[PDB]
Amino acid sequence: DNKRKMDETDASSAVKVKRAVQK
Amino acid sequence: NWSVEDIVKGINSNNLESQLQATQAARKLLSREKQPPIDNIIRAGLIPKFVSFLGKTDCSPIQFESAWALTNIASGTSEQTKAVVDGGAIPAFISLLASPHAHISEQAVWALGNIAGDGSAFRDLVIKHGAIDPLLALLAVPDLSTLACGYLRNLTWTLSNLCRNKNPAPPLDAVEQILPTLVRLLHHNDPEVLADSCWAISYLTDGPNERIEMVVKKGVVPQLVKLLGATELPIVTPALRAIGNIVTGTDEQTQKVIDAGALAVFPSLLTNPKTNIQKEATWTMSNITAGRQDQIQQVVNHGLVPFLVGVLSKADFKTQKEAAWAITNYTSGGTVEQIVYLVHCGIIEPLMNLLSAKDTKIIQVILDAISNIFQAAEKLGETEKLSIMIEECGGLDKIEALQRHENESVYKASLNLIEKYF
């Protein structure tokens, strides 16, 4: 098995953890 | 611009209108961009009052202002989100999802997205309080285009937060219940909805091959490939992450990606100006060349070997490390003819050049690839030509120097190469 999933390269990552309204 | 003390005084009167005006002042305070006093509001003991205002169905303005204030608090640090949860907000917000006022139910959607996005424990707590049924009931319309754009975007963002974390992954029943709506959103023509749907799918495909399978049986791979070819970076990035996750699975799931036509997008991804796109595309390629021989052949037929040579030659170092992995996987699983083709495309010189990097794992990877190519040459009886080619590219002295490296694996690999072919 030569396949490498995520967390075997870089870190977990992501975007938009939380959003404020500020309207 | 009230003071926190005035807000407290207003809240502590028993006067519903005074309370409403104080809560609005609190909302405006918590909505400023320049350091909103969240911790002062929390320390003043206001959160339980806001939560109780969420249930005043006769006074929907105070429901709205409380929901907005609490959403702003829940958007901060983990301690601030926890303070909101500890005030009893979760069931109060789930009750608010049924409000007949769209701005109020939207605020509850937003709040639950922030709480759930804090982490896997709060995401699971939100699911346990039963948020999923009313959230999905908000989207039970024949055509998503009849919903308000901002409302739909907030629902998609919140749904993606319910899919997000990994230790543990979300409960299977919750994922199963959300997936059809998620696929609907993945086919909806709004760039933000598309981006957030793709992120949700990328979350659900990050993990064991069973999770991947449950995503791919919904038929989303062609739509992911379509979005892979989009022009908006906020769409391409999560679509590429989702495709990369899927090709870490079984050979059949990888084949689903190939059958959808993903490889035809890869010439532009492997040359994308955004380094993160190049890096993730090269990672995806490395997992495809870890596949079966016919899948390596599909990589060859799409003209992608010269792009792998190029990204190994010149790119960000992390992308180059991914390219080295792609080459080692190719040379490990490929036929002798495929390996010969790889050398013919010019892989030796960039491999030797990278042999000078300071990273130990990339050195081990390159030495493993060199050993695999030497094994192919052995099968062809052309080991001496390969040795001459490596020496001509300046790799002989690099391997000779590396056979006294601090790492034991590098030690043995370089020594074996020198003793066997040099």
Description:
The complex is a heterodimer of chains A (23) and B (422). Chain A is low in regular secondary structure and 23 residues long. Chain A has no helix or strand. The radius of gyration of chain A is 15 Å and the shape is rod-shaped. Chain B has 422 residues and is mainly alpha-helical. Chain B has one domain (9-421): Alpha Horseshoe (Leucine-rich Repeat Variant), CATH 1.25.10.10. Chain B is built from 28 helices and no strands. The A-B interface holds A 1-7, 9-10, 12, 14-23 and B 31, 33, 68, 71-72, 74-76, 81, 107, 110, 113-114, 117-118, 157, 160, 164, 166, 196, 199, 203, 206-207, 238, 244-245, 247-249, 283, 286-287, 290, 318, 322, 325, 328-329, 332-333.
**How far apart are the termini of chain B?**
79 Å
Shape category of chain B = elongated
| Rg of chain A (C-alpha, Å) | 15 Å
Provide the gyration radius of chain B in Å.
28 Å
* Largest sheet entry of chain A: none
Q: How would you describe the shape of chain A? A: rod-shaped
Order of helices and strands of chain B: HHHHHHHHHHHHHHHHHHHHHHHHHHHH
Based on helices, strands and strand pairing, what is the structural class of chain B? mainly alpha
Strand proportion of chain B, as a percent range, falls in under 5%
| Portion in beta strands of chain A | under 5%
Number of helices of chain B: 28
How many angstroms does the end-to-end distance of chain A come to?
50 Å
Structural class from helices and strands of chain A? little secondary structure
Task: Give the tally of β-strands of chain A.
Answer: 0
Helix content of chain B: over 70%
CATH fold-type name of chain B? Leucine-rich Repeat Variant
When the domains of chain B are counted, the total is 1
- DSSP summary, beta strand count of chain B: 0
CATH superfamily of chain B: Leucine-rich Repeat Variant
Mind telling me the CATH class of chain B?
Mainly Alpha
